[PDB]
Amino acid sequence: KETAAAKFERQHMDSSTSAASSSNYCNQMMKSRNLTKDRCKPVNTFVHESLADVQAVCSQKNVACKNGQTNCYQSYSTMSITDCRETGSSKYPNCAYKTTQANKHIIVACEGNPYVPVHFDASV
Ligand SMILES: O=c1ccn([C@@H]2O[C@H](COP(=O)(O)O)[C@@H](O)[C@H]2O)c(=O)[nH]1
């Protein structure tokens, strides 16, 4: 079975491009990472940095998570990210997304041993 760590990688990691994200990026990426299979996932962020760099965030700035948990960590550096947000006219199974590239600090929740990202919380 897929570990929480592997699920984070599937849902939130895209090291292959620096930013590129054509206007079509989210439409394609959300489908293939199986984020559209059962419903259209409303909001989802992909991070364009190395896995080691995103894993390192788990030892960076400890911040409160949105749900009140204490295991969130904010990256010291900005990172290349793409936000995918479902459009108003998007109709499952034809999931449609607006693609927005940005350079922001990421906030992830980390768990386990090894202590690794398991949830994408926010960007700031
Ligand atoms: O900037 C964000 C905010 C939320 N999410 C995803 O949306 C899910 C649900 O978010 P929320 O509606 O609980 O904020 C999160 O678990 C996370 O996967 C992102 O990818 N990026």
Ligand SMILES: O=c1ccn([C@@H]2O[C@H](COP(=O)(O)O)[C@@H](O)[C@H]2O)c(=O)[nH]1
């Ligand atoms: O603030 C949070 C939110 C979620 N999770 C964990 O992240 C994983 C994926 O949750 P989600 O991003 O699908 O909500 C789960 O194992 C959940 O317990 C946290 O550790 N902290």
